[model samples]
Target: HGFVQNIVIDGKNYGGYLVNQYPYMSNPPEVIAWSTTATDLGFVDGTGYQTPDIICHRGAKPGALTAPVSPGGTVELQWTPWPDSHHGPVINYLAPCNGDCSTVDKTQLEFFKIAESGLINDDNPPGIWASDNLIAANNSWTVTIPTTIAPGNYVLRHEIIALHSAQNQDGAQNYPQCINLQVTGGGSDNPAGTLGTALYHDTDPGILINIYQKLSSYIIPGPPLYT
Candidate 1:
């Protein structure tokens, strides 16, 4: 149960959405990150996998601002300290807003996967999932803008799926975060995307598996990453 607390673009630090502070304040800060409900830094379980909550998080609203970055630029997401028990994958996607991301409809957005880091190694018991790596990295993750992506307003959808208790049918926990990005590049690749609601299902193996045992390989749950 944690959320991104800071955003770094090319070594510049920018404040992230105040998940707890925004809910009570009359006016919140202008950030690239979207707003979400504060449930002690909660998540959207498999029950809401097919809903709009999967797009961002529960009751999420678009951000009032968009952060600027160039193609191939690196963006770092610094999250609050995460639980050691939550072992799972870390994924990222991008959906073009076509215009401004501050007013785009959540349900209308189509996202194409960009980066996915799953089971790193199974040398030891339970092995090393992406979440483990995240915790080891001081609760920080990074994704690079595709060099071939066209310049436009895009929404960066990043998620961390906790699979520690996913042995049950719908026990997986999904934490999704969204941020508006203004890509200032001259590339011309516009990849196709899938609707937010169609990204995953409760029955997907990756979402309903037990990662406590040493395994051969893991199948990432969402659509394939965009090339």
Candidate 2:
């Protein structure tokens, strides 16, 4: 029940799409974050998550603007507060735009995992998850751009999966957000990626499982991080 409020890059604050305001504005402010037609602060799960909605929430469109950051630089995504009950993992992915992200076809975008965080400890039953860590950080999560990625325009896809009610089918909640970035200070690697729909399925253990019980290791559901 939340969305990214803004993104911080090198101390600069770039606003994200406001679910309640931006869609109604005559000319909304340009931002590095993409815009969505979602009316509520909900998630995509079950069979619906296998659709395009999982890419970047419902009816998401590319950002009119692109933020600049170096290959080794960090980007922080500040969300509009989250619930403590929503326990699960936080994952990030990147897709090359090859050209202008503003006009790129979103469906054609292929994403490769950049970062992922899950259970930090198994000392206690239902140990701390990434969602808990996010709330502790004032609802913000930071990720570093891969230094090996070549200089180019790419889409940053960040997401949080809620497993609180995941004991039942279609109970998992997926909240995904996207932004456009112009990566500089290049390296020379362009990793292969998977399409949005291929990231996960409702049947995936990570997407449809119970976390309240003691667990050994939680399998992250998505393409392996590109090295």
Candidate 3:
């Protein structure tokens, strides 16, 4: 799940903004892809560690972390989508490390959610999250940092919980990807906080769901926004 063979955002090559998948697999790292929740693949066992796992690029290696966002800024999240085959919701969080984000574990790091997209209207045309017409229309999603938030080295975790196959037990999939960022500018905010453990679970109703039926609405899993 880690091999990002190609990346195109907003109709342009976005390889420059990439965090190249971890190198242990012919693929990538446990922190980069969605794998079964119980297997340890030698590199890092994504499993149910953090709903998936919260791992660093390659454990504090120099330069493994790059990219910085200025205060009150907006960054585009773009990629070659999966042809709408995986339908579900999108969730994102930003965690500030008082020190260097590259040096902390997921538990040691607390985050405030920056983006949350739940079920879109059933009649909202076709796309991953039917509600996000912009992303599907433009091939990218954008995340904006609060103009009043504090500044520091942070990690932005973006996730998509695909339930297209969840009609059956454990069929649901959670895809969590992380990006290391350096927050610039200044303020006195203590960044909202929540551990990865509180995000979700296999038994959560929102997770253990059935989209196979003619549904009227869908629920999203996770705690309220930390904003």
Candidate 4:
């Protein structure tokens, strides 16, 4: 969890005014809630299969400044050390914080899906849809903000759904993370949608599916994009 300014060419890591969101194990005492894209949910909790603690960067800490950009600019969401699991749609959304992005909470968030990349086992050998391919080539997931989007502090949420073991109950893996933003512009779009609490039910088709076999249809979970 850190701020990435420039991507290291040889090491393939981001080097910038990086903020160590590693509050767990870090130098200078890692700042709170700045891990943009870490695994939010490892698996079903002990009590039930459904997970309830999904928020900005697992909501373990408060938000921290990552990379600032304009409302219509491009923010490249890349992995710091890359990931081992990679076989699912990479979805993104933004929820305005009204005043301060860091002060916002899970309940204050009303996410509107902006970008979603899904599976495309359409080729002869089949493939890992759009996200994995992007990572293979570019090493990052890029999304462009709407030109007319309102400017202000925003909490950006990005997620990945690994379906390798999705066939069985409570097998699918959900890795949703967040990045705090200080957007600047004169846009006028107030993002709103399903609250974090009611976003995904355990039995939903998108969350509980059998991707082990062939699939002709798929539904990327979450509310429709606020385009």
Residues 1-227, model 2: lDDT tens digits: 89999899987899888888988897888888888877688888887766888887889999999999965999999998899888899999999999989998888899999899988876875778899999999999999998888889999999999998888989989899999999998588888889998998888988788888998889988889787
Model 4 spans with C-alpha error above 4 angstroms: 1-21, 24-52, 57-59, 80-85, 124-126
Model 1 error, position 65 (Å): 0.5
| Residue-pair clashes per candidate | 0, 0, 0, 5
lDDT of each: 0.89, 0.89, 0.55, 0.57
TM-score of each: 0.97, 0.96, 0.71, 0.76
**Candidate 1 vs. truth: CA RMSD?**
1.1
User: What lDDT would candidate 2 get against the real structure?
Assistant: 0.89
Clashing pairs in 3: none
For every candidate, C-alpha RMSD to the true structure in Å: 1.1, 1.2, 5.8, 5.0
Q: How far is 86's C-alpha from truth in model 4 (Å)?
A: 3.5
Weakest 10 consecutive residues of candidate 4 by summed lDDT: 1-10
lDDT at 158 for candidate 4?
65
Clashing pairs in 4: 1-21, 3-18, 3-19, 5-16, 150-187
lDDT of 4 by residue, 73-187 (tens): 7767655543434466777887777776656665657777778878766452235666466567555667776666777776677666666666566666655556666677787
Model 3 segments more than 4 A misplaced: 1-63, 124-135
lDDT of 1 by residue, 1-227 (tens): 89999999976887888787877887778889998875579888889988888898998889988999866898899998999888899999999998899999999998999999999988985788899989999999989998888889999998899988888988999999899999877789888899989999998979888788777789999999889
Instruction: Name the runs in model 1 displaced over 4 angstroms.
Output: none
- TM for candidate 3 is 0.71
Off by over 4 Å in 2: none
